[PDB]
Design a protein around this motif. Structure first.
Motif, PDB file in Angstrom:
ATOM      1  N   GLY A  92      14.742 -11.392  17.012  1.00  0.00           N
ATOM      2  CA  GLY A  92      13.807 -11.783  17.972  1.00  0.00           C
ATOM      3  C   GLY A  92      14.717 -12.176  19.289  1.00  0.00           C
ATOM      4  O   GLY A  92      14.407 -12.614  20.364  1.00  0.00           O
ATOM      5  N   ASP A  93      16.151 -11.672  19.149  1.00  0.00           N
ATOM      6  CA  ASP A  93      16.941 -11.971  20.201  1.00  0.00           C
ATOM      7  C   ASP A  93      17.294 -10.549  21.213  1.00  0.00           C
ATOM      8  O   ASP A  93      16.749  -9.671  20.407  1.00  0.00           O
ATOM      9  CB  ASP A  93      18.427 -12.451  19.865  1.00  0.00           C
ATOM     10  CG  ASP A  93      19.180 -11.440  18.583  1.00  0.00           C
ATOM     11  OD1 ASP A  93      18.785 -10.540  18.638  1.00  0.00           O
ATOM     12  OD2 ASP A  93      20.118 -12.125  18.163  1.00  0.00           O
ATOM     13  N   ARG A  94      17.673 -10.646  22.317  1.00  0.00           N
ATOM     14  CA  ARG A  94      18.098  -9.644  23.092  1.00  0.00           C
ATOM     15  C   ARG A  94      18.889 -10.028  23.865  1.00  0.00           C
ATOM     16  O   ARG A  94      19.075 -11.260  24.224  1.00  0.00           O
ATOM     17  CB  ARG A  94      16.794  -9.130  24.145  1.00  0.00           C
ATOM     18  CG  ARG A  94      15.371  -8.473  23.346  1.00  0.00           C
ATOM     19  CD  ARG A  94      14.398  -7.849  24.425  1.00  0.00           C
ATOM     20  NE  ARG A  94      13.570  -7.238  23.689  1.00  0.00           N
ATOM     21  CZ  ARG A  94      12.070  -7.627  23.526  1.00  0.00           C
ATOM     22  NH1 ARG A  94      11.868  -8.846  24.241  1.00  0.00           N
ATOM     23  NH2 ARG A  94      11.289  -6.599  22.732  1.00  0.00           N
ATOM     24  N   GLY A 111      13.672 -11.387  28.099  1.00  0.00           N
ATOM     25  CA  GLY A 111      12.232 -11.209  27.421  1.00  0.00           C
ATOM     26  C   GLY A 111      11.822  -9.803  27.625  1.00  0.00           C
ATOM     27  O   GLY A 111      12.599  -8.705  27.951  1.00  0.00           O
ATOM     28  N   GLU A 112      10.463  -9.504  27.651  1.00  0.00           N
ATOM     29  CA  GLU A 112      10.100  -8.320  27.190  1.00  0.00           C
ATOM     30  C   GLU A 112      10.375  -7.159  28.352  1.00  0.00           C
ATOM     31  O   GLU A 112      11.037  -6.307  28.264  1.00  0.00           O
ATOM     32  CB  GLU A 112       8.283  -8.285  27.178  1.00  0.00           C
ATOM     33  CG  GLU A 112       7.951  -9.305  25.965  1.00  0.00           C
ATOM     34  CD  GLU A 112       8.126  -8.632  24.710  1.00  0.00           C
ATOM     35  OE1 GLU A 112       7.969  -7.440  24.658  1.00  0.00           O
ATOM     36  OE2 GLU A 112       8.754  -9.307  23.836  1.00  0.00           O
ATOM     37  N   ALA A 113       9.846  -7.503  29.620  1.00  0.00           N
ATOM     38  CA  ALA A 113       9.743  -6.655  30.903  1.00  0.00           C
ATOM     39  C   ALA A 113      11.196  -5.882  31.164  1.00  0.00           C
ATOM     40  O   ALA A 113      11.443  -4.940  31.559  1.00  0.00           O
ATOM     41  CB  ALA A 113       9.505  -7.639  32.113  1.00  0.00           C
ATOM     42  N   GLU A 114      12.512  -7.022  31.082  1.00  0.00           N
ATOM     43  CA  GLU A 114      13.792  -6.651  31.297  1.00  0.00           C
ATOM     44  C   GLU A 114      14.527  -6.057  30.177  1.00  0.00           C
ATOM     45  O   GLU A 114      15.669  -5.706  30.181  1.00  0.00           O
ATOM     46  CB  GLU A 114      14.364  -7.837  32.017  1.00  0.00           C
ATOM     47  CG  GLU A 114      13.849  -8.287  33.275  1.00  0.00           C
ATOM     48  CD  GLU A 114      14.754  -9.352  34.079  1.00  0.00           C
ATOM     49  OE1 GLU A 114      16.010  -9.969  33.222  1.00  0.00           O
ATOM     50  OE2 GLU A 114      14.462  -9.884  34.977  1.00  0.00           O
ATOM     51  N   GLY A 115      13.614  -5.794  29.005  1.00  0.00           N
ATOM     52  CA  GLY A 115      14.332  -5.303  28.081  1.00  0.00           C
ATOM     53  C   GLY A 115      14.166  -3.954  28.099  1.00  0.00           C
ATOM     54  O   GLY A 115      14.746  -2.724  26.950  1.00  0.00           O
ATOM     55  N   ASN A 116      13.513  -3.329  29.108  1.00  0.00           N
ATOM     56  CA  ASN A 116      13.139  -2.029  29.376  1.00  0.00           C
ATOM     57  C   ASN A 116      13.848  -1.455  30.689  1.00  0.00           C
ATOM     58  O   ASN A 116      13.670  -0.428  31.059  1.00  0.00           O
ATOM     59  CB  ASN A 116      11.859  -1.438  29.578  1.00  0.00           C
ATOM     60  CG  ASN A 116      11.045  -1.885  28.100  1.00  0.00           C
ATOM     61  OD1 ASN A 116      10.433  -2.687  27.716  1.00  0.00           O
ATOM     62  ND2 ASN A 116      11.244  -0.648  27.158  1.00  0.00           N
ATOM     63  N   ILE A 117      14.609  -2.424  31.424  1.00  0.00           N
ATOM     64  CA  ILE A 117      15.047  -2.093  32.850  1.00  0.00           C
ATOM     65  C   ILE A 117      16.458  -2.402  32.615  1.00  0.00           C
ATOM     66  O   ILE A 117      17.048  -3.008  31.691  1.00  0.00           O
ATOM     67  CB  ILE A 117      14.438  -3.356  33.729  1.00  0.00           C
ATOM     68  CG1 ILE A 117      12.888  -3.200  33.962  1.00  0.00           C
ATOM     69  CG2 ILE A 117      15.196  -2.962  35.111  1.00  0.00           C
ATOM     70  CD1 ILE A 117      12.154  -4.026  34.485  1.00  0.00           C
ATOM     71  N   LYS A 118      17.330  -1.656  33.571  1.00  0.00           N
ATOM     72  CA  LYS A 118      18.691  -1.380  33.426  1.00  0.00           C
ATOM     73  C   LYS A 118      18.924  -0.989  34.861  1.00  0.00           C
ATOM     74  O   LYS A 118      18.045  -1.085  35.882  1.00  0.00           O
ATOM     75  CB  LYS A 118      19.016  -0.315  32.557  1.00  0.00           C
ATOM     76  CG  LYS A 118      20.515   0.032  32.036  1.00  0.00           C
ATOM     77  CD  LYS A 118      20.661   1.195  31.032  1.00  0.00           C
ATOM     78  CE  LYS A 118      22.214   1.299  30.817  1.00  0.00           C
ATOM     79  NZ  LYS A 118      22.490   2.458  29.969  1.00  0.00           N
ATOM     80  N   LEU A 119      20.369  -0.717  35.470  1.00  0.00           N
ATOM     81  CA  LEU A 119      20.633  -0.484  36.666  1.00  0.00           C
ATOM     82  C   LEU A 119      21.859   0.594  36.248  1.00  0.00           C
ATOM     83  O   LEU A 119      22.413   0.442  35.358  1.00  0.00           O
ATOM     84  CB  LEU A 119      21.258  -1.422  37.594  1.00  0.00           C
ATOM     85  CG  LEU A 119      20.157  -2.893  37.748  1.00  0.00           C
ATOM     86  CD1 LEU A 119      20.944  -3.883  38.452  1.00  0.00           C
ATOM     87  CD2 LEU A 119      19.033  -2.299  38.744  1.00  0.00           C
ATOM     88  N   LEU A 120      21.977   1.478  37.396  1.00  0.00           N
ATOM     89  CA  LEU A 120      23.179   2.567  37.204  1.00  0.00           C
ATOM     90  C   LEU A 120      23.450   2.817  38.501  1.00  0.00           C
ATOM     91  O   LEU A 120      22.963   2.692  39.532  1.00  0.00           O
ATOM     92  CB  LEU A 120      22.626   4.007  36.732  1.00  0.00           C
ATOM     93  CG  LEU A 120      21.899   4.130  34.977  1.00  0.00           C
ATOM     94  CD1 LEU A 120      21.166   5.260  34.913  1.00  0.00           C
ATOM     95  CD2 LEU A 120      23.126   3.868  34.083  1.00  0.00           C
ATOM     96  N   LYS A 121      24.726   2.884  38.853  1.00  0.00           N
ATOM     97  CA  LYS A 121      25.582   3.211  40.130  1.00  0.00           C
ATOM     98  C   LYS A 121      25.265   4.642  40.066  1.00  0.00           C
ATOM     99  O   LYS A 121      24.671   5.271  39.388  1.00  0.00           O
ATOM    100  CB  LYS A 121      27.018   2.516  39.666  1.00  0.00           C
ATOM    101  CG  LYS A 121      27.693   2.673  41.149  1.00  0.00           C
ATOM    102  CD  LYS A 121      29.322   2.071  41.014  1.00  0.00           C
ATOM    103  CE  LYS A 121      30.255   2.178  42.365  1.00  0.00           C
ATOM    104  NZ  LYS A 121      31.505   1.748  42.227  1.00  0.00           N
TER     105      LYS A 121
END
Lengths: 258, 71, 175
Positions: A92-94, A111-121
């Motif tokens: 249950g860690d991320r 948590g949930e929302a930002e486990g699917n969000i990333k950034l790329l240069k």
RNA sequence: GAUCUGGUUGAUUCUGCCAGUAGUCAUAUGCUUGUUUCAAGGACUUAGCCAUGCAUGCCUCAGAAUCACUGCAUUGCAGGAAUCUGCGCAUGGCUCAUUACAUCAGACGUAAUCUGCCGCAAAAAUCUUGCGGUCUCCGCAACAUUGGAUAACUUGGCGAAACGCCAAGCUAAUACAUGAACCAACCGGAUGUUCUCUGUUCCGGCGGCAGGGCAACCUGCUGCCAUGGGACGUCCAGCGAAUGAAUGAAAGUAAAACCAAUGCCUUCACCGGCAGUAACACUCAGAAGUGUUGAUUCAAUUCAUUCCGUGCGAAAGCCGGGUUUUUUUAUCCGGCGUCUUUUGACGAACAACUGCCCUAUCAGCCAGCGAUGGCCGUGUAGUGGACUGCCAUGGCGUUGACGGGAGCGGGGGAUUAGGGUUCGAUUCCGGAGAGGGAGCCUGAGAAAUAGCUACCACUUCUACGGAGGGCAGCAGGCGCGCAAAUUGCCCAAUGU
RNA sequence: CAUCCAAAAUCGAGUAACAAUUGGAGGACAAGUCUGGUGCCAGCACCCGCGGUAAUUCCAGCUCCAAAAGCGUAUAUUAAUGC
RNA sequence: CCAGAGGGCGCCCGUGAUUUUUUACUGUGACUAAAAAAGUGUGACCAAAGCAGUCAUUCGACUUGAAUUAGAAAGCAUGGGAU
């Protein structure tokens, strides 16, 4: 061709000892480099402590229980660089790895929302068969690219289960930055003026909260957002501020009383 | 650098001059090098003129630079 | 053991270097391909990427192109005439890039006919155009002077171009 | 901890060496020894010579099982040896002999290049199969019931030996060799003596015929075309590669008429003027008018020619799981594996801005046999006198060339107020080597030596017909020298 | 290595024989005007020097001094060296 | 969706110096693997070492800690105007 890495030729940021074997794991070619990254078995064992030794590690990994970027990874070694997301269901860690003050790798918990969000240069922009535009980053290609086309050195927002691309952010004055490389990393700042020197390294000049302004190059810069309320992602307890050696020392003393 | 000799066909010869420092003595010293560069027939610079040149892939056995701009 | 290095050569100062090393497969020459006139033969070798290349031997057939008409069509290399590297290569009928040779002429003669509804096109295309008189006399007679612009020891084909006013007069006056 | 003392005279003051004194992971050699922690150790001379043993192999749910093999069951199931197949052994270990625009360190470059495994991302080419008849070629259907071999094994064996070998008979594939229509799109070229909107359209052209016809032309006769677009038919079109054209934005004057068009107003009108106005013949009224860089003969696009093994399959592949009710569906879902293309980093190769011991009792060094540069070529992954042919006469040096002596380079160690002197074979990084030389194969990568071939030196076994060997890998010998360890135990840790 | 000699329940120092050495004592340089032996011999001595019958230096006793589980000797190198 | 008119800024290009100017030097920043060295913290029973570990009567809290510096010559940016 070299297949072996050793403990005195490996980075300080992994925090392995001189003693206790003369060998370290050499991570494969992958989304990131050899001179900055943190390999899988190094994370698990030496940090999160769900493995005490080598055998333990692979007895987790090889069963597909560890997933960077939503894809389960069997391999013992495999690098994981800046701005990735590691999700291990069973606990249950991320984690979202990042740099932090004193130049050293850090681990956030999201948590949930930002486990699917990333950034790329964006490193380069080039053209392929059929006049199809293409970009290239650290991790991977991916294709075309509007959100609205533009230009190099800029930063996107990437979603991992499916593409929903929120917008993007650009390299322009008054924006916000976190740094990599250069013995100046693990900090955060604004963007004042960017000097351009043709045929040669391009030098930036920055600022941060409550002054103490500084400078770096321009390929050590990675954009974050327009402003520090506009950030898409969470950050460590320190906000990318260095404070003086004397201040630090003093504080550690005073609070040690317990 | 500057020019030393106009000989050959399209191939001029540069001299440079510069100093050096020895920590023990705390004094300076003079040295030269020399280079064999390419000169386009567009220019025709004379001995003792200054020049500015540029890096290039090997065009001959010695020759690794090519003229940009004369003074 | 054929090598490509500056190790066996002298310094600029007239001195002589001393080795401390054998020789590598990184440096590597292979013996010249000499590509003549005759039926197609090929002698494939392999390079340092795992990529073949095709050493050509004996090529009688070609592909040649007008500039200015923006076409290419086949032909048959007949005789070698002028080469500027040596007169050796001439006499042996070997083929190297920027060699001057002779071609069949036929497919070009053919095509220039076409330069029903078609009957209008043969006006419109022939308008705003002339053909050189230099070129003309040749093309008529049934033989042309052309130039191979391919390297036919490392592709195992000859390709070329075709000679209009400037180039053409510089060659003819040698002959 | 910026220090000194004894010795030249009958006695004295100097100069100057000799001797004393303290460290040294800096080695040897005597004497001597009670506990414990920690640690170098055949580098100096010989990179000299080696007996024996070991030091690199790998199978999961997931590539090939008729062991004449084992258990359980009694025609099946699970194990399953050594063999084919795929991957790796070019890394790691050990040693400093050669070696001064050489290596190497700091800082840069490759728009001059290659790159397996790994990451991420793509892919609309191809007349195939079955049925029926037959004329070779057709009709009728659609989920491809593809093809030929070879090991282990058996049968005869050969040889003194040999990590030596032969004939015959058996059978596999993700080995090797073939080969897939319709389903399945967008966009462009070249064209037909195709027909139908049509020429509103003549002066010229293309001709088609006769008279004179020498087919020069004159004459008379006659058809079609002289702005065009709609339909129908034919040939070509993918990725990658070669050659030739074209594209790969522009950024330095201001208002009218002229004819050729042609658009829009506008009119019964193909009457005569410019208000409106991205482009453009419908079907698509925005389905690219716009690539990156300091810089491109680059990326990519369009057109014409081409590609023959030296390129391109949905592995004609494997395994699960839910179903279904017959165990046993074209029923759905998932995990593996591989061919081709593109570009990142894991690497490789190439180039050099700056720097480093001693020697002048080493001052001229470089072109017949490339020395410096030029031109067209050749070769290579690519750049280059790297090399051929041809043409010039240059290049370097007393601010130490050329030659010789010492030496693997660096991070660093010892000593020290400071300035310095000295050492660095040896844990990490780079280079080179594997008895001495050379040449080569395989492979993405090697001039590989626990790979191959030849010669030289050394050397082993032999039934004399032949067949072999390479410790500067770990132990252990022999020789050498002032001098350096066990022919142990183990994959538990740390890695491949 | 560490722990313990019973938690009901398990050993053991007196010459503490369970007994330290290696170089020194004229000067440089901390420490004997002691007692025997030798008599320019034997030997010592890095250097200056000692030995010919009262040898502060040799060969030995006894005593004392320096360092100590270590202490001498050679060779190389640095400091001492503003040689 | 307050218009016309000149102003002012931010990108891009082109044309102009009677000759445009520069380095050494020095200030502040860029860039640069460990081990070793320097150094902060910590009672491994001290120590030479090593990056650990300390609390909490609980199914964990320190949002644990592992700072910081140095590194000839040369290269790179931007200030200074004396020698």
């Amino acid at each position: 061709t070299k297949k072996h890495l050793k403990r005195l030729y490996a980075p300080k940021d992994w925090m392995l000892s001189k003693l206790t074997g003369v060998f370290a794991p050499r991570p494969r070619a992958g989304p990131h480099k050899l001179r900055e990254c943190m390999t899988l078995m190094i994370i698990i064992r030496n940090r999160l402590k769900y493995a005490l030794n080598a055998a333990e590690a692979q007895m987790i990994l090889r069963q597909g229980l560890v997933c960077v970027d939503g894809k389960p990874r069997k391999d013992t070694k495999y690098p994981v660089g800046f701005m990735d997301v590691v999700e291990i269901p069973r606990t249950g860690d991320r984690f979202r790895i990042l740099y932090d003050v004193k130049g050293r790798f850090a681990l956030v918990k999201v948590g949930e929302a930002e486990g699917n969000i990333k950034l790329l240069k964006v490193e380069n922009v080039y053209t392929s068969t059929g006049r199809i535009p293409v970009a290239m980053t650290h991790d991977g290609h991916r294709i075309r690219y509007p959100d609205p086309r533009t230009h190099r050195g800029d930063t996107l927002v990437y979603n991992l289960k499916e593409k929903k691309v929120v917008d993007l952010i650009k390299s322009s004055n008054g924006k916000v930055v976190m740094v990599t490389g250069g013995a100046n990393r693990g900090r955060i700042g604004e963007i004042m003026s960017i000097e351009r020197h043709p045929g040669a390294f391009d030098i930036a000049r920055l600022k941060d909260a409550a002054g103490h302004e500084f400078a770096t190059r321009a390929s050590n810069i990675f954009v974050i957002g327009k402003d520090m309320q506009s950030v898409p992602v969470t950050l460590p307890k320190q906000q990318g501020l260095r404070i003086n050696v004397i201040q630090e020392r003093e504080e550690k003393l005073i609070a040690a009383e317990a | 650098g500057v020019v030393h000799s106009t000989k050959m066909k399209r191939s001029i010869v540069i001299r440079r001059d510069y100093l050096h420092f020895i920590r023990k003595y705390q004094r300076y010293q003079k040295r030269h090098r020399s280079l064999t560069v390419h000169c386009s027939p567009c220019f025709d610079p004379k001995p003792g003129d200054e020049v500015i040149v540029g890096q290039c892939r090997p065009l001959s056995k010695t020759i690794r630079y090519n003229v940009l701009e004369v003074v | 053991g054929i090598v490509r290095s500056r190790l066996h050569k002298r310094k600029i100062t007239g001195g002589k270097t001393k080795i401390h090393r054998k020789r590598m497969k990184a440096e590597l020459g292979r013996l010249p391909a000499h590509t003549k006139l005759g039926a197609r033969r090929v002698s494939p070798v392999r390079a340092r990427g795992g990529n073949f290349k095709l050493r050509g031997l004996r090529l009688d057939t070609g592909n040649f192109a007008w500039s200015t008409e923006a076409i290419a069509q086949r032909a048959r290399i007949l005789d070698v005439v002028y080469n500027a590297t040596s007169n050796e290569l001439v006499r042996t009928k070997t083929l190297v890039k920027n060699c001057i040779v002779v071609v069949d002429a036929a497919p070009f003669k053919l095509w220039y006919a076409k330069h029903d509804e078609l009957k209008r096109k043969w006006m419109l295309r022939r308008e705003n155009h002339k053909i050189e008189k230099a070129v003309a006399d040749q093309l008529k007679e049934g033989r042309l002077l052309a130039r191979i612009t391919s390297r036919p020891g490392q592709t195992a084909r000859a390709d070329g171009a075709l000679l209009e006013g400037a180039e053409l007069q510089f060659y003819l006056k040698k002959l």
